[PDB]
Symmetry: C3
Subunit: 275 residues, 3 copies
Amino acid sequence: MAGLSTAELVDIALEMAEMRTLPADSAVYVESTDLKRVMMGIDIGPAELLLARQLGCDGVIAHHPAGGSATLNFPEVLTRHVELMVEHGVPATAARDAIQGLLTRSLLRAQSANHDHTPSVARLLEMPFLNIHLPLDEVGRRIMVKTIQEAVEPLGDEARVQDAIDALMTLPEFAGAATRIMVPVGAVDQPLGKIAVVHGAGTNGGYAVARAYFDHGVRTVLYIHIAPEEAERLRREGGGNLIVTGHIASDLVGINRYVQALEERGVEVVRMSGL
Amino acid sequence: AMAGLSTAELVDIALEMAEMRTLPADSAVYVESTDLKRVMMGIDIGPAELLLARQLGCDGVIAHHPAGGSATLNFPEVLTRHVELMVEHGVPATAARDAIQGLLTRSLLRAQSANHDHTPSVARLLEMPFLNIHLPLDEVGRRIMVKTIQEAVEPLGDEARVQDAIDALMTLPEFAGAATRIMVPVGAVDQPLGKIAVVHGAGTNGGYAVARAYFDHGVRTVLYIHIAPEEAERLRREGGGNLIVTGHIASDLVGINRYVQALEERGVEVVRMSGL
Amino acid sequence: MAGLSTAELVDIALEMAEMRTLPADSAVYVESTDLKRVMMGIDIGPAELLLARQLGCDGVIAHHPAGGSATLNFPEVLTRHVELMVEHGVPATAARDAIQGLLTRSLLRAQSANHDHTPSVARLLEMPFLNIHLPLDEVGRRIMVKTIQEAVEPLGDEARVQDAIDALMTLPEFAGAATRIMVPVGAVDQPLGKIAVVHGAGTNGGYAVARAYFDHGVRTVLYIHIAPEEAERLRREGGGNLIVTGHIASDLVGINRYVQALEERGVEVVRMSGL
Ligand SMILES: [Cl-]
Ligand SMILES: [Cl-]
Ligand SMILES: [Cl-]
């Protein structure tokens, strides 16, 4: 089996996410036409690129934006929070107002980054390099939604926060994780009501997105991570439940589907940085 | 000429020096070994430092700061030491638990969100023996600093000032030789010292809530190795006590340098970097 | 030609900046008398030093403090904020008060750093290494001031924020940047009034310094970067316009003039970490 191109490594991820084009938080920094053995990690910086070269890897795949147009255009993906809220019955105006804080600060952080820092190291090393973020989190989102829905839907109004956690614990990524699923707002024994799986929108929606879901009929919100001071502000105010599943464990759901699709295409994947 | 040390032996030297009976949760062996003769030790060790250790031909790496794995995961279990330290200076066990509750809740949330296997995955791919020793060495440094201050300020009684504690600490080579200086961000050097609590070896500094628990239960002077600048400003605005901030690296070196000398006596060569 | 010493690499920067002593945010970590091929980047840590060795570079130059006396003594350059405020008509006592919190917080952060971390790696690698920060930022500050003033002085009271931005967009660093110039406080259609280009004072002045300019006859303040929460706190109070030019594009104004002078002396500069 011939090695894959970076264009093919992107296509495999878009096919499974059902996306027609690479989203703004993902980029090819260094192209290649023949990758047989790649190193894949969630967080890749210059030290990990030097590591891949010492291991003799053909190229590197990262999950998190590593710079370039992925770090620069990252705030373009945030509008996906609006789609998820509207999907769950939050009014479009309420949903758009809720992300305005996160968007304003994400644009300022994007302008401030040293975008060419990790790509310049990849170019100097001649190391094929790309990050795939939103397509893999979208895959993860879909699995997590289907897993919870199939378990909580026959329960109806009897479903509790514990039942969505039990459903997520049927996934090997959560079952085998070193981390635990937490409930920083609300409790395990509280009614579930409607659940919103908020993942695959770039970053968690923090306080303001969870508040807008709680105020518009969605009692339980699920994030993969939350800022501690944002968890505390929501917890003291109450009005709903927050499930926080765990950054790495949650990312590995869509990432493991991808690694499997690469291996079937005959690419060897060297797992590291959380894989 | 002596045989190399195992990673188990490096842990046991630190626990014995610290007078501990169990390995604290903020210290872990990521990649084991039975024979280490030349090691690189640094306060902060990440993937770049492991790559360096391979370039230098080092047998193993000793970090001070948690580098992931169970050290980063279970770091919040060490924070209960802040309770025991507060209780020793007269804070009731419930008021001490109340004061650490916020740092404990946020630390649990921070421990869950880390990429625990990042630096350990690098050490395994490099097949580089690697471990971190945090709380045991901080506990060694805490006792040295308590004894130095107490031996200097106790004969002084009520005449002892904040300055007398600082002069005592300046007789330690880590502080006498430090590039940084000991600071007093709350209170002043000319204030009465009263009772002092050395709040080192409990994982991280206590911040605002812990310093306030000590100030409210008859401990006029609190000592940290570091403080968040916003936590210092909140304490300074309220007043009613002195805070001594000794300097992160220089304070970590008090316990670390005793450990390094014990390894060198067991014939282990230590390559010093990242603050050592 | 012939290779340059670390002392001559520093002198070229101080001559350009029209300075007579070395700013405390700039230091030579590992000396040398003969550097013919150097690597230069805005951010240089241990991984970048390992890269320089793989590429066979003679030395490394950083922009940002990389430890040692540069990180330790960085707060000393913040007095430059007071000199710029006083030069734009801000009363000396108000200028001194405006920088007090940033100074107090910078002294605490300086005491907390692992100063010998990156310098210890440079020494173990025997890699000549230095950082040049304030001198290059001062060259960039002067170029930006001259560019803006030439464009807006003929407009007088009719000059707008847009006119200062249009002037900056004649510089190749801003015209070619991946980032855009932003106006987080006020707007491009607002009167410019007096402008203060606040660059070359170590770091931006945040809320407290921009408030002091606004309250003392300087309607427009320019920073290369601002903390997002600081921009939001300034925006809620209004008072004037804030132009935020972009960290890397602005740092490159002084850095490109410096590189040009090294190349004229025959030194090869390997650009990376933003250059
Ligand atoms: Cl997140
Ligand atoms: Cl600390
Ligand atoms: Cl800045």
